[PDB]
Amino acid sequence: AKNSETAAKVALMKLKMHADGDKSLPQTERIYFQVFLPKGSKEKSKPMFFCHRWSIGKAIDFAASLARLKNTAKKLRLCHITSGEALPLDHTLETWIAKEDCPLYNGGNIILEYLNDEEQFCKNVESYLE
């Protein structure tokens, strides 16, 4: 419900008001997320937008920057909000649009979390929204 297509579209207008990102991107090239930050972050989440053709690794790098997490044993990974899957670094965000299983939505939620190198999913994915 909170992670559905409709919930993402309903959140999208506020995300457009509040998100940071590279504003030289044409509007149609942008995908907006509420980005939930690693456990222990005082700020639970931050609104961000990305180029939809960026790789996950690029998006992670951009999000870590905005969240001031570039200032260890673990690497930051974007993780699907329902499956917990650490999205593969080389895939483009575009790859997740529309898909039947665990899509990404323009306006949706996503997780940024410290994982071990090679770790595949973040544990307790439901808890980021609890």
Curated annotation (Swiss-Prot):
Q: Where is this region: ubiquitin-like?
A: 27-122
Report the subcellular localization: Cytoplasm, Stress granule
The domain of life for this entry's organism is: Eukaryota
Q: Which cysteine residues pair off into disulfide bonds?
A: none
Function of the molecule: Plays a role in the regulation of cytoplasmic stress granules (SGs) turnover. SGs are dynamic and transient cytoplasmic ribonucleoprotein assemblies important for cellular protein homeostasis when protein production is suspended after acute exogenous stress. Associates with SGs and is involved in the efficient and specific arsenite-induced clearance process of SGs through the recruitment of the ubiquitin-selective ATPase VCP and the 26S proteasome.
Domain observations:
The ubiquitin-like region is necessary for its localization to stress granules (SGs) in a VCP-independent manner. The AN1-type 1 and 2 zinc finger domains are necessary for the recruitment of the 26S proteasome to SGs. Both the AN1-type 1 and 2 zinc finger domains and the ubiquitin-like region are necessary for efficient SGs clearance upon specific arsenite-induced responses.
Give the multimer and partner information: Associates with the 26S proteasome; this association occurs upon exposure to arsenite and is reduced in the presence of ATP. Interacts (via AN1-type 1 and 2 zinc fingers) with PSMD1; this interaction is increased upon arsenite treatment and occurs in an ATP-independent manner. Interacts with PSMC4. Interacts with PSMA1. Interacts (via its ubiquitin-like region) with VCP; this interaction occurs in an arsenite-dependent manner and is necessary for the recruitment of the ubiquitin-selective ATPase VCP to stress granules (SGs).
Protein known as: AN1-type zinc finger protein 1
Q: Which organism is it from?
A: Homo sapiens (Human)
